Design a protein around this ligand. Structure first.
Ligand SMILES: Cc1cc(/C=C/C#N)cc(C)c1Nc1ccnc(Nc2ccc(C#N)cc2)n1
Ligand SMILES: [Mg+2]
Lengths: 556, 416
């Protein structure tokens, strides 16, 4: 006998204040019982479970299930209650590698370590909580009681403990063989390298010899799995990757559920198929969540879906990462708050693609959305490659300079260069810093009655120009914006506007180019047409001429 | 040598904070640092039965080329019991901010000489992530008092007081104040002399050590006695336009929320009618007098301002353009405890976010010197922009709390 190293046990606890499960065993048919007795006798022979005495008070139910199109039964120990009572564990798999961050490999070998799983012992002190009972034939003897000695399939801690145990064993092998990579998924190890095939095979044999130190055997007859691998919704090949086939169904009509699934598929596709769009389809899901409801596609949604079908008409693949090269990210504006991007190292060879959508909110502008997209891409790139790409952006350097130097918030975008591919992102208007000599001065105000919702908006000017308009179904805030709109409408190309509206200032000082409010959009449209606008704020009700006059006219 | 028992606050579990994404350079730095710390027994690898986590990153201190591990214990710090057992707490020294020179030392390496309560160690878990999550993150917990944990100076305090005693006895006029991993050492000596005292002090720590800290040698020099504040000032002009007077009335209206007796009646009267913004308006005698009375009011301190150590400090910052930043620290609105202005934002001429990060650090330093704690910042930045970048520019060993301002304040105008 050759001594083997034991696998270190992970100490396991129940949640604070919780005791183990005490769940009633269901009755079973005589046929099911005989089946479970046979199955458990074999598991016992294999060391997986041990018979226990009557003192243990815990229990978990066991079932017998018929393996479809077969005369063979399978056991199912239902650990749901134990799982609720078991502590939380560290879960290593939460963040999965993105294919675009992987490196090209010549060879990837798959080793089955499913048998190794049963050399990982369960913490002795915890075994008692895994007890289960096979009912006896005719209920005439005590049921046969067992507990587990190994990680039970279906128990909360098994995946984390199996993975951590394997990682600990594999660490030295990985550290001392830096020319390979090793990745565990389920019951398999994937071992990749760029070695000539003989050497790669030697490394695999050395890995098998290393694992034997813990008595872990792998199957001589080599795995059936070989590239390409279907993994986590992807296809991995030795020198390229893609998503598994994206098939958008034909339908005569679409329900909420159909559309949710469609957008899900498009979202998944967008990581390698450039230019995928989902705005108009996603708009259809607004507010409603009756999955069976039929939603008629708008003309806009039909167009979006047609454009996506064309994008998806044939396979697209990504390449893998070469750490010796820079990463480049290029972004395009698509319209309606949509943005698309590609990340590459060599021209025309994308590592991946993606998209960004405008955040929900009252007002926005293209420079802010571009900035947000840059941040999203930056963070994504740090995760996948550990570095920021150089950016190629559809905004002139002078536009960016004007924006950030004058914007009230701190803002930054990392190293980038202008790419002249329309539509370009621009600043649509720029307010004056100082009052305009020779331009007419408009004092604006609005007010509404909170009960009737009737109101008034208007202006008075230093030239004696005046206007008041009566309004219905309005509010103080809307009338304050309406007054500014009137002044813009009625003035020349250069204008000074004096308002007491803190609300209106808060909006305009945010520099929107688009708004959910039609009124704010009308104001933006006017600003775009002007040569010069100076917007001045004064406090209300303070005796300030001009302001005081118009306030009286609209509050009447 | 014997551990102090430590607990979390009643009904709270440990931190479970996600590790944020790290650059290749920071991961490489951390792997090297932690390999060494593990060999020295400061940290140990942990298994999957520990589900806790606190984020880690790496920085370079100001004027240094060596990477320093920085654990973001903000969540653990909130969750950890308070330490008043031996002392109710060490009364903050009001004299520190009055010294001609204060030097800040990183004394954090000292904490690693004291073991941490075995039952508390699990709550200090952290992860060194891998690029693209290709390999399992390397999981560790502390065996010794960690840098950045609020319990560390509290537990090490009896040891520090004994280490420093001979120095204090020999130099009774030096003010020494510990905050987290920082030691603040203040004197009124000529700088050359001051530095010599600082190095004397390092030697006490060094001598104790050999009975080598990577950053103790460094020294961040402050001169708090020269720190400058920002009263409210009104323009002095010979020619006032309608616009100028409007701006003045706005500013005075704002100031009237801070100072009782401010009046704008006579100034507002100047603008009677409906005038062009650029029209020049002569001040009347009545308006000049009201302005003068207002100027005088603004020379006096704000009434009813006091510091309550039981309340948070709040810091607001405004971007003023051209590299200039204004800020105010208060506990109650309109009751500023400090105001200030910076323009000297270092090595960040085309980077707003680096400037703001430097400003946050400076203000936090001022706050520690004056009150012995950090303020909660209201930052003029989108969350996503800040959270992407601040760690690239951070040089301090503590981290304050912050929130985001999304709507432009009018107040910017009044501090401009
Ligand atoms: C994450 C991962 C999943 C699988 C496999 C999961 C499954 N099923 C296999 C491996 C080896 C890895 N790990 C790494 C690490 C670095 N580069 C690579 N590159 C790489 C992997 C596979 C192919 C192929 N064909 C090409 C390159 N793989
Ligand atoms: Mg009014």
């Amino acid at each position: 006998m050759v001594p083997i190293s034991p696998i270190e046990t992970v100490p396991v606890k129940l949640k604070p204040g919780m005791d183990g499960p005490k769940v009633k065993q269901w009755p079973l048919t005589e046929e099911k019982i005989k089946a479970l007795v046979e199955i458990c006798t074999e598991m016992e022979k294999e060391g997986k479970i041990s018979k226990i005495g009557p003192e243990n008070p815990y229990n978990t139910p066991v079932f017998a299930i018929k393996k479809k199109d077969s005369t063979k039964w399978r056991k199912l120990v239902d650990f749901r209650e134990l799982n609720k009572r078991t502590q939380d564990f560290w879960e290593v798999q939460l963040g999965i590698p993105h294919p675009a961050g992987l490196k090209k490999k010549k060879s990837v070998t798959v080793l089955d370590v499913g048998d190794a799983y049963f050399s990982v012992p369960l913490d002795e002190d915890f075994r008692k909580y895994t007890a289960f009972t096979i009912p006896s034939i005719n209920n005439e003897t005590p049921g046969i009681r067992y507990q587990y000695n190994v990680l039970p399939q279906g128990w909360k801690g098994s995946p984390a403990i199996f993975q951590s145990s394997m990682t600990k064993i594999l660490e030295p092998f990985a550290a001392q063989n830096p020319d390979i990579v090793i990745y565990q998924y389920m019951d398999d190890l994937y071992v990749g390298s760029d070695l000539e095939i003989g050497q790669h095979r030697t490394k695999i044999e050395e890995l098998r010899q290393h694992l034997l130190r813990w008595g872990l055997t792998t199957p001589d007859k080599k795995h059936q799995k070989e590239p390409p691998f279907l993994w986590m919704g992807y296809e991995l090949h030795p020198d390229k990757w893609t998503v598994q086939p994206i098939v958008l169904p034909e339908k005569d009509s679409w329900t909420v559920n159909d559309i949710q699934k469609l957008v899900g598929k498009l979202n998944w596709a967008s990581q390698i198929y450039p230019g995928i769009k989902v705005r108009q389809l996603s708009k259809l899901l607004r507010g409603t969540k009756a999955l069976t409801e039929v939603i008629p596609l708008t003309e806009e949604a039909e167009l979006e879906l047609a454009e996506n079908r064309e994008i998806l008409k044939e396979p697209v693949h990504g390449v893998y990462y070469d750490p010796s090269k820079d990463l480049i990210a290029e972004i395009q504006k698509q319209g309606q708050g949509q943005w698309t991007y590609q990340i590459y190292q060599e021209p025309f060879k994308n590592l991946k693609t993606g998209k960004y959508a405008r955040m929900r909110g009252a007002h926005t502008n293209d420079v802010k959305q571009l900035t947000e997209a840059v941040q999203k891409i930056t963070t994504e790139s740090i995760v996948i490659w550990g570095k920021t790409p150089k950016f190629k952006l559809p905004i002139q350097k002078e536009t960016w300079e004007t924006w950030w130097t004058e914007y009230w918030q701190a803002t930054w975008i990392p190293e980038w260069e202008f790419v002249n591919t329309p539509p370009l992102v621009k600043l649509w208007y720029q307010l004056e810093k100082e009052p305009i000599v020779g331009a007419e001065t408009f004092y604006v105000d609005g007010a509404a009655n909170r009960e009737t919702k009737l109101g008034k908006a208007g202006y008075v000017t230093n030239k004696g120009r005046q206007k008041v308009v009566p309004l219905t179904n309005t509010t103080n805030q809307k009338t304050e914006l309406q007054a500014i709109y009137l002044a813009l409408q009625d003035s020349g190309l250069e204008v000074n506007i004096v308002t007491d509206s803190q609300y209106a200032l808060g909006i305009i000082q945010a520099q929107p180019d688009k708004s959910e409010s039609e009124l704010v959009n009308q104001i933006i449209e006017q600003l775009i047409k002007k040569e010069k606008v100076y917007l001045a704020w004064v406090p209300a009700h303070k005796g300030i001429g001009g302001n005081e006059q118009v306030d009286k006219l609209v509050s009447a | 040598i014997e551990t102090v028992p430590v607990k979390l606050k009643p009904g709270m579990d440990g931190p479970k904070v996600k590790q944020w994404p790290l650059t290749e350079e920071k991961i490489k730095a951390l792997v090297e640092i932690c390999t060494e710390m593990e060999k020295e027994g400061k940290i140990s690898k942990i298994g999957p039965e520990n589900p806790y986590n606190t984020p880690v990153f790496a920085i370079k201190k100001k004027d240094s080329t060596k990477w320093r591990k920085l654990v973001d214990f903000r969540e653990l710090n909130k969750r950890t019991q308070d330490f008043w057992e031996v002392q109710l707490g060490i009364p903050h020294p009001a004299g520190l901010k009055k010294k001609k020179s204060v030097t800040v030392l990183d004394v954090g390496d000292a904490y690693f000489s004291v073991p941490l309560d075995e039952d508390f160690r699990k709550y200090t878990a952290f992860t060194i992530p891998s690029i693209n999550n290709e390999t399992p993150g390397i999981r560790y917990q502390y065996n010794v008092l960690p840098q950045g944990w609020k319990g560390s100076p509290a537990i090490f305090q009896s040891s520090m007081t004994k280490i420093l005693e001979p120095f204090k006895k020999q130099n009774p006029d030096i003010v020494i104040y510990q905050y987290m991993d920082d030691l603040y050492v203040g004197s009124d000596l000529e700088i050359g002399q001051h530095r010599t005292k600082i190095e004397e002090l390092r030697q006490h720590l060094l001598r104790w050590g050999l009975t080598e800290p990577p950053f103790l040698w460094m020294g961040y020099e402050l001169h708090p006695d020269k720190w400058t504040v920002q009263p409210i000032v009104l323009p002095e002009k010979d020619s006032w336009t309608v616009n100028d007077i409007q701006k003045l009335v706005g500013k005075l209206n704002w100031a009237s929320q801070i100072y009782p007796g401010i009046k704008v009646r006579q100034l507002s009267k100047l603008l009677r009618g409906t005038k062009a913004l650029t029209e020049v308006i002569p001040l009347t005698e009545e308006a000049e007098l009201e302005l003068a009375e207002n100027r005088e009011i603004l020379k006096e301190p704000v009434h009813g301002v006091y510091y309550d150590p039981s309340k948070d400090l709040i810091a607001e910052i405004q971007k003023q353009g051209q590299g200039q930043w204004t800020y105010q620290i208060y506990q109650e609105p309109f009751k500023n405890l400090k105001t200030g202005k910076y323009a000297r934002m270092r090595g960040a001429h085309t980077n707003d976010v680096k400037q703001l990060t430097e400003a946050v650090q400076k203000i936090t330093t001022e706050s520690i010197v004056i009150w012995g704690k950090t303020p909660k910042f209201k930052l003029p930045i989108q969350k996503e922009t800040w959270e992407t970048w601040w760690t690239e520019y951070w040089q301090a060993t503590w981290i304050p709390e912050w929130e985001f301002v999304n709507t432009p304040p009018l107040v910017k105008l009044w501090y401009q």
